[PDB]
Design a protein around this ligand. Structure first.
Ligand SMILES: NC[C@@H]1O[C@H](O[C@H]2[C@@H](O)[C@H](O[C@@H]3[C@@H](O)[C@H](N)C[C@H](N)[C@H]3O[C@H]3O[C@H](CO)[C@@H](O)[C@H](O)[C@H]3N)O[C@@H]2CO)[C@H](N)[C@@H](O)[C@@H]1O
Ligand SMILES: [Mg+2]
Ligand SMILES: [Mg+2]
Ligand SMILES: [Mg+2]
Ligand SMILES: [Mg+2]
Ligand SMILES: [Mg+2]
Ligand SMILES: [Mg+2]
Length: 60
RNA sequence: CCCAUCCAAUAUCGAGUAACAAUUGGAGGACAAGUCUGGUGCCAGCACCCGCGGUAAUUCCAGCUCCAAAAGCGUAUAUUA
RNA sequence: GUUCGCAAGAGUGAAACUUAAAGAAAUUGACGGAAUGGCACCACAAGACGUGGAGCGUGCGGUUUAAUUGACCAACACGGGGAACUUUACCAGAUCCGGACAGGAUGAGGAUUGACAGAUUGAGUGUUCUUUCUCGAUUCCCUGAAUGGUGGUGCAUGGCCGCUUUUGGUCGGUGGAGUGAUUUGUUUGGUUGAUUCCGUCAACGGACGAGAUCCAAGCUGCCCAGUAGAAUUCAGAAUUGCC
RNA sequence: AAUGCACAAGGUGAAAUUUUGGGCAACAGCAGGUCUGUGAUGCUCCUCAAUGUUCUGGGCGACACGCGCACUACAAUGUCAGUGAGAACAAGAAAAACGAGUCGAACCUACUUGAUCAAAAGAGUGGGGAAACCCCGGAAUCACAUAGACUCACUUGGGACCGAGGAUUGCAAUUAUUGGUCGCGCAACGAGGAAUGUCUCGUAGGCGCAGCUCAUCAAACUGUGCCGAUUACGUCCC
RNA sequence: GCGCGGAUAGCUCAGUCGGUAGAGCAGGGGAUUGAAAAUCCCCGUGUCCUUGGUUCGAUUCCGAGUCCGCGCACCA
RNA sequence: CGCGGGGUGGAGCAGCCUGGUAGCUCGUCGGGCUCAUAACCCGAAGAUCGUCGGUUCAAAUCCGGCCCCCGCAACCA
RNA sequence: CACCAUGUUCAA
């Protein structure tokens, strides 16, 4: 009765996925991450999980 | 009036898209000249005669391009060959 | 209109209008409820075994249906068509691009690909809406196009098939005949399934088809076999009679 | 017959007149069929909610009816239940995949089993690349002094229709895929009107069997064998 | 003049004696054809004079009244 | 109106048992023959006997009342 | 010598 939309992928506006605080980086620390990977399924290296009500996400 | 003569005889206006612009009938045959493109689909129309047109029209309605005569060229009725 | 006639009629004799041929003689063909000679169990004869009647299978028509997707002797168990899905061409929906490549505007500060859970849905189908991560130039958005179609037209075609036709038929060359289309060769006679042969012959020389070649079956030679078979001779076993 | 080309009858022979049976077949043509065979094709239509292409579900198969073509019968020259003898053509498994450049499994099959108890199955174990295994290919008609049941009836003829278990093919069986079991059989049908088809000897007819379609399904078709006649060997009547 | 009678699609026309409408052609589209004609299917469709008395409602009943036909008349 | 005749399958007509899915010709259907149609051949269907009553075991017939159709007459001053 | 009638319009 009504035509569907034929979805295009949404732009994330200058961030696909993101890190943590204290961008000074005075030789003490690497920056922390904001999600996890749960590896070997399938890659786990740069695979970062979704929030989705803090649940999960690929796949892995 | 026209035509003719003239743009100095000391001394006369003027072409450019020379826009100051050719048309009238045709392109199957007789009969000179398109197996071009678009439209219509035995309709609309053409065709003196033969014939064209029934969804790929050498013939209709048009655009292009050609042919013929040309300040002319079609058509009709008489009339001679 | 007039002159003849007892009358039927006769003689004389137009036009308006209409039409693109009507005719004439020949040729080639097709056709005859026209002669003549042949042939064929897709003809009959003399017969066989059936179909048409019945029940079912299957194809065709019609009627239904959302839809029930060529052909009318030479269509109808045929399109190798005995389709549950697929096939598939039809109907109700749903995806995907398999719209290459160009040109123009977004574009890495992201063009875009894909998807878990829910809602949507016929669908534990991300198709889409919410959600956020992945993909990392492959794409996407416009414009121009192109490639796909078991879309149409077999009356635009190629190819193949069927059918004219199970018939013996067609064609040149050069000569003859006629203004010519066209004839002759290619024939009246016998003959064969056969323009097959013999003879005749204004024809003579050729080409194809027919025959030949090819396959299969029947008899047969050579070759041949621990992928075919046979006999024998010793051993082993079985019957062994009075019924 | 009258030269010739040849013909009939008989011989010879395995075979006697195209030996038999097929294949192949000229020239012209049909406005035959095929655009549903092709990456055969011109033109023209559709071309992103597409007439493309894929899913999902239907349909092609739906039945007052009319027709082609088969199949099964209407029975005693038979149906049944036994038992015997005994054919030919034929088919048969796999990929640059998944497994252990070599080998396996997909295909057909015998044999055992299932079996101190129905078929249909389901399982083992062999073999076969096919003249080598199936296979001494145990086809069905037929046969039988079978001292077998029926005895002329819509009947033990016929098996349409459909009811209930069950098991296999498939990813899926409902508008039963197919087999098997017990019911139903009171469904016509007793040899078929007008009409009509094919056929001249290993033929017609009967009989089955392979292959092909095929995961599952032959009343089909292409082949093959088996049993095996009636009539004509004529004519132009249609 | 009186009486008998008939009006329903663009036209033509059948009606259950007093419960609501039939076709067909003409029309618009398909199937068919080489295009047509025929042919078949599907579609637009008739407030029935005017109305009253109103059977649950007048087309179907009866009587009034446009329409258009038919039976029958000074007196010797 | 008097009087007289008839209503029968879609058409035209018959019908003497008081009675045959009532009969006839044509038509309508279904199949054949034909390339196709007609002719022709083989089949099958179709009747509120106009209607209501009554006689009867039984009615198209028999007796009626009605509705129609069709005439014969409808006289002499 | 029984009966044996007919096949729409253009076009190819
Ligand atoms: N290519 C052979 C052709 O045979 C034709 O002739 C054939 C016909 O005369 C005739 O054929 C007939 C046929 O007409 C008819 N319609 C059916 C008949 N069965 C045939 O018969 C022929 O074939 C069968 C083989 O099955 C045999 O019974 C018979 O011996 C044979 N004469 O027999 C000949 C076949 O041998 C023509 N001569 C010719 O078209 C051609 O040569
Ligand atoms: Mg044109
Ligand atoms: Mg022009
Ligand atoms: Mg059908
Ligand atoms: Mg010459
Ligand atoms: Mg009969
Ligand atoms: Mg006539």
């Amino acid at each position: 009765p009504k035509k569907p939309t034929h979805r295009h992928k949404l732009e994330k506006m200058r961030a696909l996925k993101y890190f943590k605080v204290t961008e000074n980086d005075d030789g003490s620390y690497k920056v922390e991450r904001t999600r996890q990977d749960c590896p070997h399924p399938q890659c786990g290296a740069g695979v970062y999980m979704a929030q989705h009500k803090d649940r999960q996400y690929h796949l892995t």
